[PDB]
Design a protein around this ligand. Structure first.
Ligand SMILES: Nc1ncnc2c1ncn2[C@@H]1O[C@H](COP(=O)(O)OP(=O)(O)OP(=O)(O)O)[C@@H](O)[C@H]1O
Ligand SMILES: Nc1ncnc2c1ncn2[C@@H]1O[C@H](COP(=O)(O)OP(=O)(O)OP(=O)(O)O)[C@@H](O)[C@H]1O
Ligand SMILES: [Ca+2]
Ligand SMILES: [Ca+2]
Lengths: 126, 369, 165, 116, 133, 339
């Protein structure tokens, strides 16, 4: 309507995030997330982007393997930091267009839909 | 004595030829003429070959392809017999033009120069194997689902209806339906594939509400299936909703009321002295009659349309109406067997068969009909 | 009220209604489905039995010759536990494609619903299945409690951390 | 249905065995009236509810196979109405009945076409 | 050069990219084959290398002209047009196309609503409509 | 006590040869397999893929050496051996809708199905084709188990109508007349000679005795019921604490063995004196199961000895194991078992 939606293509080696309509990505980060080697906000201590490639106190993990997602929770946290820490835009007040692989399964699309709609409460999903 | 008689059914998509008397077909090949452009024999190679169908929706479009089709049907691949030294029996579709019927015998007497010919109605031949005189033969192949009414060895051309929904349309419905389910298939590349998937897991349900309920609520209708590429897809309710267009032709944007509604509106539109007779003898013949669960649905809807209109609400006066349809075990090609029977019976019976001398002397339209 | 003999009568009843067998449809030509689900033949449907350990938590078993449908309504102590139970039951319902012994929708007036088919009863051990149900109940309780405690802990931590700044 | 006084007398006598043995006589299974079945069910429920925990074994062991099946069916009918903490006593009774008649009792309870 | 020749670093792969594209265009529908050979689009970062599409189109048109000559030598054929397109944002085309699709009004009509998601279920996101043509 | 692991899925029907040299079975598939015995190990020899669905019933005529089979394919196949290939013949069942067994006369077979009509079928040599006349009188449900009597003219069958009826499928054009039986004098095709009194439980099991004097059946109400026409068609039932039985057969004239959902072959004896049935006990005493088969029994035929003195009992179940039992070893094991 008045504001702009967000666009996020998660690649194997690099994740491209930004706002739709822009000429270039607002943030082109690395496809890797930092984790611990569990209760509370233990899942809130998660670093994504380039600031996770060379962590020493944490462990650098890779999620997107060959275009397909291997560990869902990690990708979830990554999208979390991509939404709040990197983009910092109101999810309930914005739509979202996510990218899929060529061999993306239907069930996988279903799961992505679940993670985007149930947890984030996005106003739009494509 | 009669120099080996034979029977050949040249349908829209699948051609079935067999010797006279055979309880089955001796050769079943796909009807498609194939051509190359680079430097079941044709169906194997279709990804890199230009395929054409001679018989479009029952009628012949390209005679230059149909001639070669006949030469390949009587060739050393399936039949391997001399046309000039053997009789034959062809199958024709209902509501066919006189020009087509004439051109057939014309090309069978001049181009092939056959020594014997015997044409018969497919609607009649389909009931002939069942051994009856009055009945309703409904054929649903790959071209069109024509419903033909037969009585005392004859079919009322004013009673023969037709629904524009065929096995090809079933394939297209399944392939269209799977796309929405989350998967992805091509309109031309995976055509035969989709046709196979439909032939395998798809069906027709009795209670559409209850079947939709079982599909949405339970996970028991959902079955898995492996593709040629190795990847596997899991189809559920799409199995039945795809063939459901046979009952209600409004699910594929088509003009009509449905096969059940057509049959019912063609049943009540008959003589009142024949209404109780034609409703008790209905023969199911055609490729689309192998869908598991068609018979029950036909009986149910036929029961509905003769209890809401014939009984007009009278529940007690519903039991009196006879309801008996027979889904034969060999209903997949009753047209062929029915010929294979007829051609075996009238093999040397009198002289009621078209001759070559009678086709060379005079009368290309020498047809006692 | 709450005992172990409840899940013992539940286990016994589950063992009694796990005597299903494959059966073709008598109405439809060449069709095969669950008898307990569609309930088309009154001759094949047994008298459904309900077992209640309390006014809030109970289990209803409806058996058939070719199906056994077990609905389970779990205890609801608080609102948070109820929302969590609904969310977990829904999340499990979404994966009904994986759980071929469960159905996508819960039975009306119950928390969750699992349809143990005759086909499912033929390709899985009945004893192991009963064990699966009992474990399903005890795990439901324990996991719900653990989730509650974890959530509360998270709320406490977040509140403390935000208050400390 | 059954007779109330015959059970009330044994209940007043303290002999629970007689009351329990009499409560299952002429069960309204063939009856079409749901009122009679509800009455019989409520009666059996009342009979079982007042019973002490440690003494139930003897009375349960005193019953017959057919009586065990009728008691199981009546208990199943009573299980659809859990109130006044009768569910615990009904549970102990279900355990005793299960140990007594085995899976055959409940199997007969489920396979039954006409019951309370 | 590893793309133009996979045999260099992979013993379990002998097919060059030219052959892969050729087989991909040939194993698809014949009626759309010319269109597939006409619009060859490079997407991803690994295709941003210099003069990749040039060599690709070179090998493809070479094999194509060869097969055409072979077919015209035993013919007792029209010019097969082939073009490998090089986009300005070929490095991140997957995201560019999305930004171009989401900017249109149709993207508000095509995108599955949260309402439809809560009312019908996850199956609402299972089939995405294609518009913009 | 000889269980053989053949498959992982369940078993549908169990059939044997004349000299019991070969065994035939189906594994819930569109095809039926025939295996033989060459040494300690078993090996498959024949395979028939004629049916177009899950095979339900299969029986082999011993003297005729010819096996007929009928299942969900809504059709019957009277398979006979043709050289090195078993040729099947499609015998029209003429049914709009799970059981098959040849007669002692081995000339006509009964096909009981869900069409609520015991479809008897004889072979017409005049037309060189099989014909199937349907007996539907007093039948309300499917025919679970069908077993003949020694007369080869009267058939017995249990229904989902909670009863085990004994009707007559005698075709007077395939055999001579039937002698007077104790089950009645008037024997006509379609005439109901006997019936059950049960109003609960499904009659999954049904088998007649060798003398033809008594007919027994197993109901799914955890109850077994044997009737004797020797005492004015007296019916004697008994409730088993175990689960319901699926298959029932008699070992002796007064001793029968049966299994089912209890997943353990049990033995029982009925005293003609008092006129009541008694339980012998558990003949199968030893995953996590306390028995051989890890699922319910599905069929139980006789290997050799007859229904008066069986020397070996063959048991097929839903466990995928072929249970070969011997009365001698069973009597040598359980000393408290009176046959
Ligand atoms: N098991 C099956 N269930 C449903 N449909 C089937 C099955 N097998 C084949 N078909 C369909 O039947 C069609 C062809 O049937 P058939 O050969 O009997 O008619 P035809 O002779 O090709 O057509 P026509 O007689 O109209 O010229 C195919 O399009 C196929 O999709
Ligand atoms: N300037 C460059 N020129 C050519 N190739 C490059 C350049 N920079 C990076 N690459 C290569 O491109 C690869 C990443 O490409 P791309 O971003 O298309 O993949 P992705 O989207 O991260 O993963 P996927 O293709 O699985 O979605 C890296 O492996 C890197 O080696
Ligand atoms: Ca990419
Ligand atoms: Ca045809």
């Amino acid at each position: 309507g008045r504001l702009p939606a967000c666009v996020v293509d998660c690649g194997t080696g690099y994740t491209k995030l930004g706002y739709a309509g822009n000429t270039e990505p607002q943030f082109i980060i690395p496809s890797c997330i930092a984790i611990k080697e569990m209760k509370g906000v233990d899942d809130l201590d998660f670093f994504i982007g380039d600031e996770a490639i060379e962590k020493p106190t944490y462990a650098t993990k890779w999620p997107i393997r060959h275009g397909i997602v291997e560990d869902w929770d990690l990708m979830e946290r990554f999208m979390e930091q991509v939404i709040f820490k990197y983009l910092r835009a109101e999810p309930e007040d914005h739509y979202f267009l996510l990218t899929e692989p060529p061999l993306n399964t239907p069930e996988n699309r279903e799961y992505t839909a679940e993670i985007m709609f149930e947890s984030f409460n996005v106003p739009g999903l494509y | 004595q009669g120099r080996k008689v034979v029977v050949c059914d040249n349908g829209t998509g699948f051609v079935k030829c067999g010797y006279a008397g055979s309880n089955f077909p001796e050769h079943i090949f796909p009807a498609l003429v194939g051509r190359p452009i680079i430097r079941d024999e044709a169906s194997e190679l279709r990804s890199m070959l230009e395929v054409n169908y001679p018989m479009e929706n029952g009628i012949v479009r390209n005679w230059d392809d149909m001639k070669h089709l006949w030469d390949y049907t009587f060739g050393p691949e399936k039949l391997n017999i001399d046309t000039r030294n053997c009789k034959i029996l062809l199958t024709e579709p209902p509501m066919n033009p006189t020009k087509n019927r004439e051109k057939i015998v014309e090309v069978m007497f001049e181009t092939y120069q056959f020594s014997g010919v015997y044409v018969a109605i497919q609607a009649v031949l389909t009931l002939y194997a069942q051994g009856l005189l009055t009945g309703v033969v409904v054929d649903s192949g790959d071209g069109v689902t024509h419903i033909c009414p037969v009585y005392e060895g004859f079919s009322l051309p004013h009673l023969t209806r037709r629904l524009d929904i065929a096995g090809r349309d079933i394939t297209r419905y399944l392939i269209k339906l799977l796309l929405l389910r989350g998967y992805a298939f091509n309109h031309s590349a995976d055509f035969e594939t989709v046709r196979m998937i439909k032939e395998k897991l798809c069906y027709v349900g009795y209670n559409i509400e209850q079947e939709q309920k079982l599909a949405l609520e339970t996970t028991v209708l959902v079955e898995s299936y492996t593709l040629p590429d190795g990847r596997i897809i899991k189809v559920g309710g799409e199995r039945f909703e795809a063939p459901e267009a046979l009952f209600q032709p409004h699910l594929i944007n088509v003009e009509g009321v449905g096969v059940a509604e057509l049959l019912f509106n063609t049943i009540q539109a008959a003589d009142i002295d024949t209404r109780s007779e034609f409703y008790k003898h209905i023969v199911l013949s055609g490729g689309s009659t192998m869908y598991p669960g068609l018979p029950s649905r036909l009986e149910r809807e036929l029961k509905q349309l003769y209890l809401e209109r014939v009984l007009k609400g009278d529940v007690e006066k519903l039991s009196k109406f006879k309801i008996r349809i027979e889904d034969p075990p060999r209903r997949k090609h009753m047209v062929f067997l029915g010929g294979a029977v007829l051609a075996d019976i009238m093999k040397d019976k009198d002289n009621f068969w078209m001759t070559r001398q009678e086709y060379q002397e005079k009368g290309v339209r020498v047809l006692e009909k | 009220a709450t005992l172990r003999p409840y899940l013992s009568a539940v286990r016994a009843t589950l063992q009694a209604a796990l005597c299903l067998e494959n059966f073709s449809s008598q109405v439809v030509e060449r069709h095969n489905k669950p008898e307990v689900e569609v309930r088309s033949s009154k001759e094949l449907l047994l008298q459904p039995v309900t077992i209640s350990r309390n006014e809030k938590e109970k289990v209803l078993i409806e058996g058939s010759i070719n199906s056994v449908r077990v609905s389970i309504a779990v205890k609801q102590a608080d609102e948070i536990e109820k929302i969590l139970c609904h969310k977990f039951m829904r999340f499990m319902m979404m994966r009904a494609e994986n759980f071929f012994i469960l159905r996508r929708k819960p039975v009306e007036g119950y928390d969750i619903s699992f349809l143990i088919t005759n086909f499912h009863t033929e390709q899985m051990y009945k004893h192991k299945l009963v064990d699966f149900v009992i474990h399903f109940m005890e795990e439901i309780d324990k996991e719900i409690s653990e989730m509650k405690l974890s959530v509360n802990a998270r709320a406490r931590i977040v509140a403390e951390e935000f208050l400390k700044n | 249905g059954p007779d109330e006084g015959e059970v009330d007398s044994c209940l007043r006598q303290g002999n629970m065995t007689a009351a329990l043995q009499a409560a299952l006589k002429n069960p309204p299974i063939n009856t079409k009236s749901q009122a009679v079945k509800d009455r019989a069910g409520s009666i059996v429920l009342k009979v079982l509810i007042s019973f002490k925990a440690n003494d139930i074994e003897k009375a349960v062991q005193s019953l017959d196979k057919n009586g065990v099946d009728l008691l199981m069916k009546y208990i199943y009918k009573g299980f659809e109405s859990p109130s006044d903490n009768s569910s615990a006593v009904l549970l102990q009774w279900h355990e005793k009945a299960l140990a007594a008649g085995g899976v055959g009792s409940i199997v007969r309870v489920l396979t039954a076409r006409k019951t309370v | 050069e590893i793309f133009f020749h996979p045999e260099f670093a992979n013993p379990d792969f002998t097919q060059p990219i030219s052959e892969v594209v050729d087989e991909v265009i040939q194993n698809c529908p014949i009626d759309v084959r010319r269109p597939l050979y006409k619009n060859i689009v490079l997407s991803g970062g690994s295709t941003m290398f210099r003069d990749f599409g040039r060599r690709l189109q070179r090998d493809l048109k070479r094999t194509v002209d060869a097969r055409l000559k072979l077919s015209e030598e035993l013919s007792g054929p029209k010019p097969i047009d082939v073009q490998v397109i090089t986009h300005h944002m070929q490095r991140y085309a997957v995201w560019f196309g999305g930004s171009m699709l989401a900017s249109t009004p149709e993207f508000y009509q095509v995108c599955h609503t949260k309402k439809d998601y809560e009312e019908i279920g996850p199956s609402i996101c299972r089939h995405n409509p294609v518009f913009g043509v | 006590m000889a269980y053989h692991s053949f498959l992982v899925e369940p078993i549908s029907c169990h059939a044997w040869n004349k000299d019991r040299t070969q065994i035939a079975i189906c594994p819930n598939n569109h095809e039926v397999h025939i295996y033989e015995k060459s040494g300690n190990k078993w090996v498959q020899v024949h395979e028939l893929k004629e049916h177009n669905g899950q095979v339900t019933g299969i029986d082999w005529a011993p003297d005729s050496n010819r096996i007929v089979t009928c299942g969900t394919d809504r059709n019957a196949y009277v398979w006979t051996l043709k050289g090195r290939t078993w040729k099947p013949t499609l015998v029209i069942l003429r049914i709009n809708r799970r059981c098959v067994r040849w007669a002692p006369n081995e000339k006509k077979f009964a096909v009981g199905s869900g069409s609520r009509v015991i479809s008897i079928c004889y072979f017409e040599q005049e037309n060189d084709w099989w014909v199937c006349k349907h007996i539907k009188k007093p039948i309300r449900s499917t025919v679970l188990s069908l077993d003949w009597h020694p007369n080869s003219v009267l058939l017995a069958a249990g229904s989902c109508d909670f009863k085990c009826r004994i009707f007559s499928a005698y075709i007077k054009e395939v055999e001579e007349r039937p002698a007077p039986t104790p089950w009645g004098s008037k024997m006509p095709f379609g005439e109901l000679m006997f019936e059950s009194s049960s109003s609960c439980g499904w009659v999954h099991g049904v088998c007649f005795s060798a003398n033809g004097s008594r007919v027994a059946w197993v109901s799914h109400d955890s109850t077994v019921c044997l009737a004797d026409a020797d005492k004015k068609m007296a019916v004697a039932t008994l409730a088993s604490e175990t689960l319901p039985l699926l298959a029932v057969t008699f070992i002796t004239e007064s001793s029968l063995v049966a299994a089912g959902h209890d997943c353990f072959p049990v033995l029982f004896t009925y005293d003609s004196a008092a006129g009541k049935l008694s339980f012998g006990g558990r003949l199968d005493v030893p995953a996590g199961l306390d028995s051989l088969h890890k699922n319910s029994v599905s069929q139980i035929s006789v290997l050799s000895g007859g229904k008066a003195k069986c020397s070996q009992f063959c048991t097929t179940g839903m466990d995928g194991g072929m249970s070969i039992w011997d009365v001698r070893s069973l009597e040598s094991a359980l000393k408290d078992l009176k046959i």
